[PDB]
Design an enzyme around this catalytic site. Structure first.
Site, PDB file in Angstrom:
ATOM      1  N   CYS A 167      -3.246   4.112  -9.329  1.00 50.16           N
ATOM      2  CA  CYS A 167      -2.276   3.113  -9.711  1.00 50.16           C
ATOM      3  C   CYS A 167      -2.955   2.029 -10.535  1.00 50.16           C
ATOM      4  O   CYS A 167      -4.139   1.725 -10.330  1.00 50.16           O
ATOM      5  CB  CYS A 167      -1.634   2.497  -8.466  1.00 50.16           C
ATOM      6  SG  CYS A 167      -0.407   1.230  -8.858  1.00 50.16           S
ATOM      7  N   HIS A 168      -2.217   1.421 -11.455  1.00 50.87           N
ATOM      8  CA  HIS A 168      -2.837   0.401 -12.292  1.00 50.87           C
ATOM      9  C   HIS A 168      -2.557  -1.045 -11.834  1.00 50.87           C
ATOM     10  O   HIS A 168      -3.066  -1.982 -12.436  1.00 50.87           O
ATOM     11  CB  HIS A 168      -2.517   0.608 -13.788  1.00 50.87           C
ATOM     12  CG  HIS A 168      -1.062   0.483 -14.132  1.00 50.87           C
ATOM     13  ND1 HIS A 168      -0.415   1.367 -14.978  1.00 50.87           N
ATOM     14  CD2 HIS A 168      -0.129  -0.425 -13.757  1.00 50.87           C
ATOM     15  CE1 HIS A 168       0.853   1.012 -15.098  1.00 50.87           C
ATOM     16  NE2 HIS A 168       1.051  -0.076 -14.374  1.00 50.87           N
ATOM     17  N   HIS A 204       1.094  -0.586  -4.058  1.00 51.53           N
ATOM     18  CA  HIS A 204       2.015  -1.661  -4.441  1.00 51.53           C
ATOM     19  C   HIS A 204       2.079  -2.831  -3.500  1.00 51.53           C
ATOM     20  O   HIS A 204       2.857  -3.764  -3.722  1.00 51.53           O
ATOM     21  CB  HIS A 204       3.408  -1.135  -4.720  1.00 51.53           C
ATOM     22  CG  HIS A 204       3.476  -0.271  -5.939  1.00 51.53           C
ATOM     23  ND1 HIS A 204       4.527   0.587  -6.188  1.00 51.53           N
ATOM     24  CD2 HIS A 204       2.610  -0.123  -6.972  1.00 51.53           C
ATOM     25  CE1 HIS A 204       4.319   1.200  -7.343  1.00 51.53           C
ATOM     26  NE2 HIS A 204       3.163   0.787  -7.836  1.00 51.53           N
TER      27      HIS A 204
HETATM   28 MG   LIG Z   1       1.951   1.841  -9.403  1.00 54.76          MG
END
Ligand SMILES: [Mg+2]
Ligand SMILES: [Mg+2]
Ligand SMILES: [Mg+2]
Ligand SMILES: [Mg+2]
Lengths: 434, 434, 434, 434
Positions: A167-168, A204
């Site tokens: 994930c970024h 997240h």
């Molecule tokens: Mg993400």
């Protein structure tokens, strides 16, 4: 290093695949082939044409018809699919509105996330089995959301799989901290990688409990920074929060920091879905946006137009870094340069007090054929309570999806922080979303 | 980064302190002061004079008379002392020979290791209380043996302490592997650092279960290497195993590899003390040496002469890299770099199936004010059985020492692989050694 | 309760089977059938004959030629076999004498225990598969030694099995404690059951850390008892330790109590094989016996004559309580009583600080279709160290047997407290016994 | 057994106090004194007078004015207090109604439970210190709610304390099951205790996953029972659900059973507070009652009148069993008859997948000076998710109340299933309730 084979599942992707094409085209450390597999062969073939026009010839792309063909002899497997269609997504994201429930994204938690996850389970079960049968020693990198559920299904179905989720979102917080260092201390930061953070949590919903730029402790600075811009919010240089549905003024992050004492490490639009607060019903006041399905429809249509243009003009992707770490991780895994970066993997102690095996996000050391989580300690107590709760739901969704137990999935649904409605309303909603 | 303060306990040291000085004298990243503390002030005073003749004036050395003065305002605490006199050691190392027990080093396990640990316990309890009282927030680097017991006592007495233990044995195995790469493959290796190993175990009983140089897997190569030189041994470039008590031809390491399938990662002389074998009784056939206490008295005397030499010639230490990571680790702890290297720390999962809290050696990610163990997996099953056994003994020694319970210490004594004599002989030996 | 079906594996027995027949023939709570299975069909038949001359016809007995037949529709499965023959046992128990290793029993640990375990692994894996395939819902009671290994094999091969290991050793110490109450306090004790003990450890190496008779704490009393008779020993009323190889004067137990502070709860002849001591080589000073395999052969021959006697006179066993808890456990499992008694079962916290899943002995609460272990706390530290080490060897034997890995078996052999010889002597010994 | 001393904290009680006096006066197994302590000395004095007209003079009662005097030399400490007053409780139970939140009891979870918990924390901290100081070896039986939080505080403040929490709710479900056996099978049940249940969970939210009457499995029978009476509900012999705020027709339990497949083991009025359901909004539909505080005040006035009646009449209490297990447990702890019954104790494995140390309710084996939880396995997955969540809240409350952290208490408040309102509403409510 030559003759690398990468299998790409979701190979007609107009996002992650393009971004991977760009980075492959500029890394001189490697060459080989990319097998593009997509349920939609037409999109995979356009990527084959676009990819073969990119960079040197360092990488040869091929659209292939089956999973087995993509994985055969693959060294790396990349997964970047959409669990369902935009129509499914419309339901995911907006139907709960009839009950007063708003969602900014809907691909991770809340009702959208729960239902999207159920839909994703059998897709990932099937991929895990294929990888087990055809490329069991490959490293798998998953980009798909909901990330904790998809990755966990990989390990439930194929226990010996070598898989991570990428994930970024943490990168965006590092950028925020890099600009803060400049604004507060007047000193330049060469790269966001120089913001050295101890990040932990679940996808997240990650949190930074220690951070530094060289010898300087960033937590006390974020304290003052947060205090100063808590009401106004703070915009990155050259940005305004209204520029796009992805922008924000970090008001939600500042608010969470005041409450919990760790730095929230994902965009406001993600953070807002994990806990009670006024955020989702007053996004304008909190200076971020919800992402509606009209936006996704529009965006899909202009990506399609872009794709068709690139073909017509026989161009490839920009030979320009995407800011992703996918290719860097791949190089590291092949022994071409070790790396410490944040990844999602089964918990074996790297986040304290959270169930073991649960998919958690932390730093890991990546070197030849090795991804090794780094012990990162504990979350603030309040965040840990929230994370344990979401992990509860995520584990139940993964189980519910593998055994087709909708009763169990509904329990998770009812346990989600956003589902604050009568039980019989939630059941009607849940059933309608299925 | 200026005004750093290092407290050095055992500051009269003629081993670790000197190596630290050399490394400090050439690092341009840092400067400040070193408080030298030692029961023998005369030795500390001499290191103070040699120290202040070393390097740019980068570091100012001062011999101080008490722990409190050394510790106050300290950022780093280094510990390198001898628990007892060389006369005590003559007993640790040689008395058990009357019962047929030989020891090559006797500072880690076996009868000497146990008795020595016992002696060290109240010394480190006192150090831990002082660090707690005067420098609670410093990082502590322990170099003293028995490593696992001393380091464990620090945490037992000051649970919040920030301490690691450091050892250079793994570096010697990395150099061996680098030379194997050259000899087996014909290619240069520029630095032993480039031999990226997954190392795990307890101090002096460390194992490498994965290893690479760039893209190449070293484990299959070590297997060939071991088959070829298993009988004759293998000697490092320009060396002969007879040159000193410290040298070997790695016959013991090759023998353990064939049995266990992981690469033993300490000198033959240390490995030999942890398990049953012909090793300790036929050291010349196994091509390594024992270290008799006379060697240590002699070595100390010629080190004393060398020290007087530098004081007469008013010279400082060699401005040459020691090969140690102490100073690199200190720089990383100050945020002046980030580093992955092997260290000793309480187990929180970084080694599988070994008791938690016990002091284990693995790679750790080190950055500003952070030492974070990297999850390193499992030992071979045979090795893990032995390691759990020694850990039992090490835990009992630490407890026995803090509570003065000689009964419990005798249980550990009895449970030690080197103590294969009747119980009454062992009780008599044990009491004599006390 | 009627039409119960019990399968007896090893039903040609002359120990547990006969003893079971007695207990069965007098319990009025139950009735049904016993399917007797035994590699040796002829011997199962003779138990059939003799069983059917027992009780009221409360229980109908039948020799059956196959596991499958025996197991079909079985509520209860009893396993009481001899892993291999008495000639094999001659090797297990006496062959190591040539290296100066003596064993009193050799069916549990030591070189004989290890080898006998190896032998018993494939036999129990096979029984585990049959139970899984033909009687998965049955309760399984194991009586066979080496108890910890056999029972563990059951769970490793059929994870969902409902199996316990039963042993009568603890009853002997309860009897000792009952006599002690009388001798020390003058008060009578109706039944050994009334000696309420908190017992824990592994089979044949059990310890009692708390004990009472009604309101009276027995620990302080055993302490006095132990102090008074430590040197002389104590012999049960109307007994002399020389009466048989099963008798002792409890000198070993007294010696172990003084050292560890918990009451050892197995006969001296078993305890003596688990730890270092002068016991095995000075059995007369320690007032217990070794059991040579010549005694077992003589004993078997008479049991065979007794057998044929009964068959010839159309007579059955005696309608008399055997002293075992077997039938009473069965009744509790069927709902016909509830019961708290000691059993061997996988560790899930009932013994502290010992691996989980390892077979440990504690009290359990037994009721309809339920055996639930009772949390029993920790062993004294030195005892816990020993037990962990044995458990280690035990797990390694189980795995070695299942995967045919002699290399692993030898590591366990080497780690056994009774194997105090040179490695090469031990290797030769091991291979000779394998 | 004579000269037993019991300290009663909250000895002014007109509830647990009286039930204890009755049970004491009929147990001929024991004799001694009861020290009655209560913040209201006059209330304790009355129980003294009434108590010293009760029994044979088997138990002598004495009202004492300090904790020290009550506790010193005590064998058993009983705690039965109201944390705060009836006015405080009016706020706990009724204030949240202004936000649309209803509670049936408010003494366990939800807003009232969280607030009452904060109030109880410092009281129990003080009691735990006193017990540590004056009666460290006593067994402590807690009856006070919130039970999980109250008992936990005892252990946080005095880790070696010997304490259990006792509640009678599970007994009510055993009665239900006894009456069900009679109704469904026509066969009689002598004692609610013959209903042998595997019970587990946390206080007021316990579940029975296996249950039997002798050889009969009760769960399949409860399945039919529940399926038949789910809509009508089921009333106990000679009872109407409208008879008192304590009665119900078990509709909630039947409903929980269909969803989860384990028999909920607490009255409907407690069960209702632990999860989302329409229960608390439509109690009349679900056939149970809420308990208004006005009822508690009226009940208190009638108890004060009964107290004065008994005094004037110089009558003691009735020599009649209460139905509680309190005195039985005391007798068992003194060595006067072992016992298996449900208690609340720190989790050490007796309930799977629930944090350790957390106060959980399961069967335990009780004997002389021993309370030993029994391994009871797992809750249904949906129930486990809810219990982990409530446990999170209870642990936060225990800490917050000690360390005073209203910030932490508020997270717990927001994580409580009954608090389904906007965050600023919640904060106003929470702040108001402080
Ligand atoms: Mg993400
Ligand atoms: Mg060393
Ligand atoms: Mg036995
Ligand atoms: Mg209650």
């Amino acid at each position: 290093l030559d003759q690398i084979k990468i299998a790409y599942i979701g190979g007609g992707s107009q996002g992650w695949a393009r971004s991977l094409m760009s980075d492959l085209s500029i890394d001189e450390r490697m060459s080989g082939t990319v097998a593009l597999y997509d349920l939609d062969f037409e999109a995979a073939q356009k990527n084959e044409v676009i990819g073969n026009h990119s960079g040197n010839g360092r990488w040869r792309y091929e659209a292939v018809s089956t999973l087995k063909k993509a994985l055969s002899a693959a060294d790396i497997v990349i997964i970047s699919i959409l669990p369902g269609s935009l129509d499914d997504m419309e339901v995911d994201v907006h139907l709960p509105e009839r009950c007063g429930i708003y969602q900014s994204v809907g691909d991770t938690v809340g009702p959208g996330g729960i239902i999207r996850g159920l839909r994703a389970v059998p897709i990932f079960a099937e991929i895990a089995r294929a990888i087990r049968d055809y490329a069991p020693e490959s490293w798998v990198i998953n980009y798909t959301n909901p990330m904790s559920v998809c990755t966990r299904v990989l390990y439930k179905v194929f226990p010996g799989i070598k898989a991570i989720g990428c994930c970024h979102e943490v990168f965006g917080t590092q950028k925020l901290l890099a600009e803060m260092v400049t604004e507060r201390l007047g000193i330049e930061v060469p790269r966001r990688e120089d913001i050295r953070v101890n990040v932990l949590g679940i996808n997240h919903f990650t949190w930074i409990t220690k951070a530094s730029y060289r010898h300087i402790d960033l937590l006390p600075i974020f304290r003052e920074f947060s205090a100063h811009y808590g009401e106004s919010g703070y915009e990155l240089e050259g940005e305004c929060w209204r520029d796009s549905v992805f922008c924000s003024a970090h008001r939600v992050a500042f608010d969470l920091f005041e409450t919990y004492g760790a730095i929230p490490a994902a965009g406001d639009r993600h953070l807002a879905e994990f806990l009670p607060g006024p955020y989702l019903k007053q996004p304008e006041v909190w200076k971020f946006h919800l992402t509606p399905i009209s936006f996704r429809k529009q965006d899909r249509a202009e990506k399609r137009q872009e794709t068709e243009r690139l073909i017509v003009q026989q161009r490839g992707v920009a030979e320009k870094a995407s800011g992703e770490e996918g290719v860097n991780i791949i190089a590291a895994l092949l022994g071409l340069g070790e790396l410490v970066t944040n990844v999602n993997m089964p918990n074996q102690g790297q986040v304290l007090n959270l169930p073991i095996q649960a998919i958690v996000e932390t730093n890991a050391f990546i070197t030849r054929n090795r991804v090794q989580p780094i012990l990162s300690g504990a979350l603030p107590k309040g965040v840990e309570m929230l994370a344990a709760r979401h992990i509860s739901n995520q584990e139940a969704v993964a189980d519910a999806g593998l055994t087709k137990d909708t009763g169990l999935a509904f329990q998770a649904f009812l346990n989600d922080p956003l589902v604050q409605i009568d039980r019989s309303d939630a059941e009607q909603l849940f059933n309608d979303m299925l």
